[PDB]
Structure 1
């Protein structure tokens, strides 16, 4: 799919994304915090439709993500993220999607997620996370 790179910010206020219980993760749009102000990054959309959107609006700054995990798996030959789970210091959001295949997890002992980059086609192909104090 088309690659994207939101770059780095000062935190995260909200994360909206698509998921399909049969296929995999779809589009993603993150609203970061930029020096105290909301900063909605560009919407990274799926090439297709038929998803369910989930909107995680974090209670910034008292609430932050302490772990991101999910499942990687092939869908029609494509290796994509099929499930996602966002755990914060207040609650867990997810899992959303198909929890089958290879699991992955990024627990954070100290530090903060401050950005996302990746690639999305029909589904979320892969993604990376910016970390910082």
Structure 2
């Protein structure tokens, strides 16, 4: 897939993603906070269409990133991120996608998610998160 790297910002305001109930996560885009103002991140798009879109609009700054969890698995021979769940201090957003394969979870006791990087082909191949105090 096509690797992406948004880099580090000061927080998250909104997460826009897409999924397919038979496959995996497709699209991924973030509206970050940049020193008090919204900063619209680049839209990381799947090579294919047919996904259901979701908008996770956070009550920034009181609402924030307390856990990211999901599933990785095999889709048409590829190991990809099949589902994602974003859990805040206020609400649980998800699961989005297919909750099958191997789980992963990143709970946070102290600090914030301030950026995303990874790769997207037909689906979200993998991802990493920038963490800061």
Report the TM-score, using the length of structure 1 for normalisation.
0.99
Partner of 1:45: 45
SS at structure 2 position matched to 1:125: strand
Partner of 1:88: 88
Pairwise CA distance, 1:8: 0.0
Partner of 2:122: 122
What is the number of equivalent residue pairs in this alignment? 133
**How far apart are the structure 2 equivalents of 1:19 and 1:94?**
11
**How far apart are the structure 1 equivalents of 2:37 and 2:7?**
16
Pairwise CA distance, 1:32: 0.1
Q: CA-atom RMSD, angstroms?
A: 0.4
Partner of 2:56: 56
Structure 1 runs not aligned, ≥5 long: none
**How far apart are the structure 2 equivalents of 1:2 and 1:101?**
23
Structure 2 runs not aligned, ≥5 long: none
Aligned pairs for 1:1-133 within 5 A? 1-133=1-133
1:37-80: CA deviations, max 9, x gaps? 00001000000000000000100000002000000001011000
**How far apart are the structure 2 equivalents of 1:73 and 1:45?**
20
Report the TM-score, using the length of structure 2 for normalisation.
0.99
